[model samples]
Target: SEREKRVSNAVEFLLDSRVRRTPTSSKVHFLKSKGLSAEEICEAFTKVG
Candidate 1:
């Protein structure tokens, strides 16, 4: 499931310390290129929040 991998890996990267420093549209666009979604990232945020 490529989409599954993209979601998990992309989300994991979202939590990555490097990019986690701040939100960037370039990052969003990059992730979106991989089938990532803001809704998914937002939901993931709710977890470790």
Candidate 2:
């Protein structure tokens, strides 16, 4: 359940982040791009926070 919860929160966070916006946020954009896929984004969320 921990993993699932983490993934869910992380995915939510990613969506709420500026990464989806056109203006972009910061250097974090690079990381966000890397996590566009399902597998990479799961770990990206945990790493972000």
Candidate 3:
């Protein structure tokens, strides 16, 4: 479940550390800029919700 863990942790970091609001599109871009693939980002976003 490494993929799941990475996704969940990324989401948690985004929600808990990166920002205080839900401008999630920007957050997604940030993740992508940091080298997360679109599929991983989408999977993480889905896990967060």
| Candidate with the greatest TM-score versus the true structure | 3
Candidate 3 or 2, higher TM-score? 3
Off by over 4 Å in 3: 1-8, 17-22
Determine which window of 10 residues in candidate 2 has minimal summed lDDT. Answer: 22-31
Clashing residue pairs in all predictions, respectively, total 0, 0, 0
Q: On residues 1-49, what C-alpha lDDT tens digit does candidate 2 reach at each position?
A: 6555545655666666565553434424644554444465546555655
Best by lDDT: 3
Candidate 2 or 1, higher lDDT: 1
Give per-residue CA lDDT, model 1, range 1-49, as digits (tens): 8656766786677777777766566776786777767886555455443
Relative to the true structure, candidate 1 reaches a TM of 0.56
Weakest 10 consecutive residues of candidate 1 by summed lDDT: 40-49
- Candidates ranked by TM-score, best first? 3, 1, 2
Q: For model 3, what is the alpha-carbon lDDT of residue 37? A: 79
Task: List candidate 1 segments past 4 Å from native.
Answer: 37-48
TM-score of each: 0.56, 0.37, 0.61
Candidate 3 global TM-score: 0.61
The Cα RMSD in angstroms, rounded to one decimal, for candidate 1 relative to the true structure is 2.6
lDDT of 1 at 1: 87
